[PDB]
Design a protein around this nucleic acid. Structure first.
Ligand SMILES: [Mg+2]
Ligand SMILES: [Mg+2]
Ligand SMILES: [Mg+2]
Ligand SMILES: [Mg+2]
Ligand SMILES: [Mg+2]
Ligand SMILES: [Mg+2]
Ligand SMILES: [Mg+2]
Ligand SMILES: [Mg+2]
Ligand SMILES: [Mg+2]
Ligand SMILES: [Mg+2]
Ligand SMILES: [Mg+2]
Ligand SMILES: [Mg+2]
Ligand SMILES: [Mg+2]
Ligand SMILES: [Mg+2]
Ligand SMILES: [Mg+2]
Ligand SMILES: [Mg+2]
Ligand SMILES: [Mg+2]
Ligand SMILES: [Mg+2]
Ligand SMILES: [Mg+2]
Ligand SMILES: [Mg+2]
Ligand SMILES: [Mg+2]
Ligand SMILES: [Mg+2]
Ligand SMILES: [Mg+2]
Ligand SMILES: [Mg+2]
Ligand SMILES: [Mg+2]
Ligand SMILES: [Mg+2]
Ligand SMILES: [Mg+2]
Ligand SMILES: [Mg+2]
Ligand SMILES: [Mg+2]
Ligand SMILES: [Mg+2]
Ligand SMILES: [Mg+2]
Ligand SMILES: [Mg+2]
Lengths: 115, 50, 49, 80, 48
RNA sequence: GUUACAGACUUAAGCAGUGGAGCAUGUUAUUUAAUUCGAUAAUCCACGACUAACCUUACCAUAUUUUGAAUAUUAUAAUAAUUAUAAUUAUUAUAUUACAGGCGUUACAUUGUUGUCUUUAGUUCGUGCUGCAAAGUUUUAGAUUAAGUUCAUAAACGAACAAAACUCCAUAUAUAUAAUUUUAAUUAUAUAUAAUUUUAUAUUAUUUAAUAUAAAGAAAGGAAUUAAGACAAAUCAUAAUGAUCCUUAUAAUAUGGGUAAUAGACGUGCUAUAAUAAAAUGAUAAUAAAAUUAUAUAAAAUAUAUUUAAUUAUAUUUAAUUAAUAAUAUAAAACAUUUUAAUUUUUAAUAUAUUUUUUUAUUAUAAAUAUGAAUUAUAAUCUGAAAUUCGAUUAUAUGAAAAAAGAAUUGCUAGUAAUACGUAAAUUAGUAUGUUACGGUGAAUAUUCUAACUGUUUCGCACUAAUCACUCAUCACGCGUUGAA
């Protein structure tokens, strides 16, 4: 609607905001909210023992779930910038941005790899 | 837990910005004394942050 | 002045490197204020014996 | 769902209304498996750009709908 | 991160006595004012 | 489009490759609704991109949002926390403008950063001295070094950014600690010491310097660091900012499609073209290192593919450990037996015998394979909500090209190259022929001739935004002046 981009009013993440970041964050929140439910639906679907009609219904429900319920849709962005390439998980940062931070001394220990 | 460590260092970085923002004052739109501050250093002992 | 340290040159004390790339005695920094014309910055680098 | 167990890939469609009265089904699915329950129903499967009219024969029963709506144009070279 | 983090807005709430200055915001406002002056301000938004 | 010397993976040897084949990947071109954008001589082309199914994405088709992600201003109203049924605050809601927002355009506006010259040896300041002076000397006559590092000489004497050194890895020794069940003490990790090695005898050239010999030592590498300037080199797609342009659209969300299109072409790789080389097998499990495992690592064992079982692949189900303790994971080449078409250079029927896993005799055994693994058909499995465009396995079939590759061309001097030697992680829900890392086994060769390209130098110089420099004449366009007639 007009007052918000997505259906649910989620907060903005602190520090660096970006449109893509915003999109990702919301998606992550929705996944967190509807994680157990999705799992339960999946279980019901992939069951040889259960009634077939019920499993079909569960599968249909899973199919009909939105873009923001999907775990696969989540993509690890850089947190300092808003890039989504070469994003290292141990400091949620992009390649160049990580290097910049590392040389400054923001990642406490990281340091030059001299051998 | 490295996730927690990452979250802590993010927090610290965010606080630095906040501190920087605070550092500049105004006096009835007469004088704007810009106190310069260094980059903060955050000491995370088991008990306490400093 | 100078950016070499002569305490490390002829004694038992050795130089050490901060993040394995900045001689301990050095301390480098920059800060980039925006102007009317655009962006600029100001590198500073002190030695401290 | 490809694997024989847990298949087929089922999607919700306006199937029963099409069966009652010949109203083509405009699918933007392209990953729904064709079933025996819709052979002889008119589908209008998406191609990226334009919806493609298809009448599902009994030979199509195993396949996906997107397999019959070819997205890219047939390549040629301008011999200059 | 933690969405509830202190912002410049709050630095007025917590410490009203201290007249703080957000520098980046002030700069932005000055730029906007300059744009308005020289006929390069934003066009008025359509409502319909 | 200049002299002259010196240098090294420059060349020369040498080893392995590219260039031919098929595939992978990037690029081009063309196509396309869209094939997003950038990188595109050295200094682009598995580059940005450490994983394009959706998402990521920026592109396209169709839908639908319009103060939207912020900050501030002005109003109505509702809920919750705090106090002793009222009030103070914090928020939310509906609006209200300034705006917000823009991977739109310009790295020939910038920042920061990076590439190349470059680990190349250059780049300058005080005082003194020379010149009327700009300037010069210092900063070099020699020589030497890897080197503007050094000794010889010198109107110089000192001093900085580079060089070297301190640094890290690895090594040797010492001390400390580890109740030698987290054990690997053959270790790990803090702190030292150690070398840019020393000494002496001789032989050449001038007290020293190269060679040789000897005795003393564990004493032998790699990494990071790549100056000034330049290339208006790369980046506005990490990010930010100037100017400029868009503001119901160049901003925002969903569903699908595209980034994977294919004539020719160009790089990088991978796999090959069989016997100084490929395949089966090898459980008192021949021998490593480095690193990962709370967004997990998954052991044993059962089941199916598969009559034994092992192998390999899935499923079943989670033992152990969030780690010097358990798991990823019995490392692999090696070495050993067996087999191997081309090959009547073998087989099998007879005899044969002091070559018996074999010999001899006589009979019959008549250019792509028992190489390679492209291409395709069907069936299963895996991840995921989803595998059609467009992913990864396994099985049963399919079995192209390719017979060591033209001119030309790439990397590498040692634990290096090479390796049909394997191992790990980063990026993932899922996929490495890529990337970044680890050990294993381990060579061949060697400097004199010439192209280039770096130093510094010779000569020249009408250039100084410095050769993308400067610069000459006609012709063409206008406005004067003065001749001829
Ligand atoms: Mg050669
Ligand atoms: Mg060719
Ligand atoms: Mg080829
Ligand atoms: Mg652009
Ligand atoms: Mg392009
Ligand atoms: Mg899309
Ligand atoms: Mg703006
Ligand atoms: Mg956009
Ligand atoms: Mg730049
Ligand atoms: Mg550009
Ligand atoms: Mg000079
Ligand atoms: Mg010089
Ligand atoms: Mg050095
Ligand atoms: Mg022991
Ligand atoms: Mg430089
Ligand atoms: Mg340029
Ligand atoms: Mg440039
Ligand atoms: Mg810009
Ligand atoms: Mg931006
Ligand atoms: Mg838009
Ligand atoms: Mg591509
Ligand atoms: Mg390359
Ligand atoms: Mg072979
Ligand atoms: Mg097992
Ligand atoms: Mg273990
Ligand atoms: Mg073994
Ligand atoms: Mg052939
Ligand atoms: Mg074969
Ligand atoms: Mg093979
Ligand atoms: Mg992903
Ligand atoms: Mg090796
Ligand atoms: Mg020299």
């Amino acid at each position: 609607m007009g007052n918000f981009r997505f259906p649910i009013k989620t907060k903005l993440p602190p520090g660096f905001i970006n449109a893509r970041i915003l999109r990702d964050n919301f998606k992550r929140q929705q996944f967190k909210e509807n994680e157990i439910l999705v799992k339960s639906l999946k279980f019901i679907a992939r069951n040889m023992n259960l009634p077939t009609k019920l499993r079909l219904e569960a599968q249909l429900k899973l199919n009909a779930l939105p873009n923001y319920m999907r775990s696969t849709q989540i993509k690890n962005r850089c947190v300092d910038s808003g890039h989504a390439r070469f994003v290292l998980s141990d400091f949620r940062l992009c390649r160049y941005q990580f290097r910049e931070n590392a040389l400054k001394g923001n990642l406490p220990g990281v340091k030059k790899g001299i051998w | 837990n490295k996730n927690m460590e990452i979250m802590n260092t993010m927090n610290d970085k965010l606080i630095n910005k906040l501190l920087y923002k605070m550092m500049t004052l105004k006096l009835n739109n007469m004088n704007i004394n810009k106190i310069i501050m260094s980059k903060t250093i955050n000491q995370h002992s088991l008990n306490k942050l400093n | 002045g100078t950016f070499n340290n002569k305490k490390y040159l002829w004694s038992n004390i050795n130089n050490n490197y901060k993040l394995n790339y900045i001689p301990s005695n050095h301390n480098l920094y920059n800060n980039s204020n925006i102007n009317k014309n655009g962006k600029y910055n100001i590198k500073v680098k002190l030695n401290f014996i | 769902s490809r694997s024989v167990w847990k298949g087929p890939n089922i999607v919700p469609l306006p199937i029963r209304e099409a069966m009652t009265k010949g109203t083509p089904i405009r699918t933007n699915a392209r990953a729904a498996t064709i079933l025996p329950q819709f052979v002889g129903l008119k589908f209008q499967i998406h191609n990226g750009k334009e919806y493609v009219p298809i009448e599902i024969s009994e030979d199509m029963v195993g396949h996906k709908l997107g397999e019959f709506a070819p997205t890219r144009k047939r390549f040629s070279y301008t011999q200059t | 991160g933690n969405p509830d983090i202190l912002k410049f807005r709050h630095l007025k709430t917590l410490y009203p006595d201290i007249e703080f200055v957000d520098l980046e915001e002030q700069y932005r406002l000055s730029m906007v004012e300059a744009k308005k002056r020289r006929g390069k301000g934003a066009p008025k938004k359509m409502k319909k």
